[PDB]
Amino acid sequence: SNTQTVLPFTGLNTPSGVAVDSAGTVYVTDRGNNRVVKLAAGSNTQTVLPFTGLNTPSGVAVDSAGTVWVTDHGNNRVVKLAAGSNTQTVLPFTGLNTPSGVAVDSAGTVYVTDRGNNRVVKLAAGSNTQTVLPFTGLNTPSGVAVDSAGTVWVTDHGNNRVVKLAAGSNTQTVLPFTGLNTPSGVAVDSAGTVYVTDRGNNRVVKLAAGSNTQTVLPFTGLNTPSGVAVDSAGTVWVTDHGNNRVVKLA
């Protein structure tokens, strides 16, 4: 489209994370207001999800069954709400320090960027014991994404790079992005295109599947974009954190 639309959220303050489910519902962590909000496709009226006591919520993910996971960055925990639940559940992660991003795969496995500990942790579906993924050399990692094949992508925020780890691998690959300044969010689509919010450069970039060099997306007037999500139609949603808004691009 090359023409962005602003989503009709109201009263956002420094929105951080964004996720989109199969029905086109958009979930946003309204980080400055300690709340998570959602907008149904073609809806005009946002709903506030019944989380309690959040402290700078920073990442959000949503599975096929509509369960919502949120990184409660200030409380060193990850919380979830099942589709029809009014009580949040704290996941049995241990030792988290300022957790930032979260992603969930088709099997229900949850991946979290444990930002203050420079590591990525996972809770396999049906398991109560976390494992630490074998990334190396991370510095204050923020965004995380997982594709259909179980490959995990991480924005290595402090090192201005984006890395990936194939499932069951001891091999970390640095992706060929260029000139990144504080990459903070990452998304991958079913074709394997990777989208990254380049926060310090006020732009969003992508490495199209099969390409050796990045493209800058035709967004307009971004200020410190923070999070990115993609749906099955290729629509890109970005939390334009410094402008207290959420933008999308078909």
The CATH number of residue 54's host domain is 2.120.10.30
Burial of residue 116, with CB atoms counted within 10 A of its CB: 0-12 exposed, 13-18 middle, 19 or more buried: middle
- The length of the chain is 250
Nearest 10 degrees: Cα torsion 183, 61, 63, 22 = -70
DSSP percent split of the chain into helix, strand, coil, nearest 5: 5, 40, 50
Structure tokens of 93?
């992660």
Q: Which amino acid belongs to residue 69?
A: W
Task: Provide the experimental method for this PDB entry.
Answer: X-ray
Structure tokens of 6?
């602003």
Structure tokens of 174?
């640095």
CA-closest candidate to residue 135, choices 188, 173, 180, 192? 173
Resolution, rounded to a tenth of an Å? Answer: 1.6
How far is it, in rounded angstroms, from Cα 209 to Cα 147? 12
How far is it, in rounded angstroms, from Cα 104 to Cα 82? 13
Sign of the four-CA dihedral 175, 231, 157, 69: negative
Structure tokens of 211?
């390409």
CA-closest candidate to residue 194, choices 180, 215, 222? 215
Find out whether 9 and 46 touch, Cβ atoms under 8 Å. Answer: yes
- Mapped onto helix, strand or coil, the DSSP state of residue 241 is helix
- Mapped onto helix, strand or coil, the DSSP state of residue 75 is helix
> How many domains, the chain?
1
Find out whether 244 and 33 touch, Cβ atoms under 8 Å. Answer: no
Structural domain boundaries, residue 132:
5-249
